[PDB]
């Protein structure tokens, strides 16, 4: 009984299924004319990988990090309060001469 | 997405949640091809190594593993869920759904904060943790 309703829905969709799945085909072709697929943009390079031998494949080196310990894993940057002299100096301002 | 470990059936997800006893299991339910899922998975891959001590990240394909779709309501394009000692952990994100994160997060620091908060709360025994950021608004200005 589910198949009956599913076929009914498909039949109702059959009104413009061919006329809208054909227009989207032309739209896809037009879009790909200007903006090709990413895989096709590397097709020639991917083809040229057939000349890399097994020893050459094994000769690929492991990537390391140039920056040293102080940059990769720096110690915790302790935050400290502003010195009391700043409160004192802000407090000195606003005290005005009487003459 | 293609770097994080993948769970291929419901039993594997069961064992992954059961196996970890001192780390929060972070599971992304979704599809590798989903753009939201690709953003979430690349953020997870970015923070995968940093949270090694207190988190393990797995990826589950809901089409391949529809075993938890009914109970966990895994019907959004992307879903991130946290478990601790075989116990689903809820997060007061402010989105109205505390049971999961069902959107892609851009910043990799926010996900680290969420995982850290979940770990703290779950190790304290809580079943709900209040996230450090309220996600009731995307803060777009």
């Amino acid at each position: 009984a589910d198949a009956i309703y599913a076929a009914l829905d498909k039949r109702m969709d059959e009104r413009r299924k061919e006329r809208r799945e054909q227009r989207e085909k032309e739209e896809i072709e037009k879009y790909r004319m200007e903006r090709p697929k990413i895989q096709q943009q590397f097709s020639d390079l991917k083809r040229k990988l057939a000349e890399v031998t097994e020893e050459e494949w094994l000769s690929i080196p492991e990537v390391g990090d140039a920056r040293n310990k102080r940059q990769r894993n720096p110690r915790y940057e302790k935050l400290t309060p502003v010195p009391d002299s700043f409160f004192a100096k802000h407090l000195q301002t606003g005290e005005n001469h009487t003459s | 997405s293609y770097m994080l470990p993948h769970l291929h059936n419901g039993w594997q997800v069961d064992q992954a949640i059961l196996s970890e006893e001192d780390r929060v299991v972070v599971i992304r339910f979704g599809h590798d091809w989903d753009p939201t899922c690709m953003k979430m998975d690349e953020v997870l891959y970015s923070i995968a190594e940093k949270v090694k001590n207190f988190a393990v990240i797995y990826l589950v394909d809901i089409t391949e593993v529809p075993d938890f779709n009914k109970m966990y309501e895994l019907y959004d394009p992307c879903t991130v869920m946290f478990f601790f000692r075989n116990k689903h952990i809820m997060i007061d994100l402010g989105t109205g759904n505390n049971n999961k994160i069902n959107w892609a997060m851009e910043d990799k620091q926010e996900m680290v904060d969420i995982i850290e908060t979940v770990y703290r709360g779950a190790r304290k025994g809580r079943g709900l943790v209040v996230s450090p950021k309220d996600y009731s608004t995307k803060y777009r200005y």
């Binding site: 940057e77 935050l79 409160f87 | -």
Partner: protein, 49 residues
């Protein structure tokens, strides 16, 4: 600027005040900021050096 300049100290105090104006608003100091403040304080304590 001569070594016996009549204003060699007033200008130094004015210069150090501008460098400390970035810290006039109270804020948590990191290592670089506190190093700069230490240098300014050392210059103020021994103006001639």
């Amino acid at each position: 600027p001569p070594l016996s300049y009549k204003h060699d100290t007033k200008l130094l105090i004015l210069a150090l005040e501008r460098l400390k104006e970035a810290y006039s608003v109270k804020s948590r100091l990191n290592q670089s900021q506190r190093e700069e403040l230490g240098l300014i304080e050392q210059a103020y304590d021994n103006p001639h050096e």
